[PDB]
Amino acid sequence: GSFTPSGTTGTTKLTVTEKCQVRVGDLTVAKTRGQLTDAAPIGPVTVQALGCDARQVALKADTDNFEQGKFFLISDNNRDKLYVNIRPTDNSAWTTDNGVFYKNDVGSWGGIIGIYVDGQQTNTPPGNYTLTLTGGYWA
């Protein structure tokens, strides 16, 4: 099948720091690299489909947020990666296919996707990281 973009885009942001951490300006979600242990939560992403009674709901990551079957937040330097797993909170069945995370069943799903650290990465370089997901459907 293939992804058809049809929806809005959610960006999950995380600033990764060392132990001595200097917050400058507006409050922003930050973690020290020591907090990037396996399964550590990064954040939730709300998803609400409508008009999808006969389509499989899908999310597509930006090109700089995936490599084959793996997802990652990408540093603002465009290089450094923070690998993550993406999981619905209702434990419904989804499939990953080259940047696309799509629901196995048709229907206008409403849910919450959690983004978690995939494998211990406590040596991740400091930086401002982002994962960008766009709604659509899989056919």
Residues contributing to the site for its own copies (CB under 8 A): 4-11, 15, 17-26, 28, 30, 32, 45-52, 54-55, 57-59, 108, 126-128, 133-137
In single-letter form, the type of residue at position 91 comes to N
For residue 63, the SS3 value is: helix
Q: With residue 87 as reference, give the H or E element that holds it.
A: strand 81-88
Our CB check for its own copies shows the closer of 60 and 81 to be: 60
Smallest gap from residue 119 Cβ to its own copies (A): 23
Our CB check for its own copies shows the closer of 22 and 93 to be: 22
Q: Distance between CA 85 and CA 46 in Å, rounded?
A: 16
Our CB check for its own copies shows the closer of 17 and 85 to be: 17
In single-letter form, the type of residue at position 75 comes to S
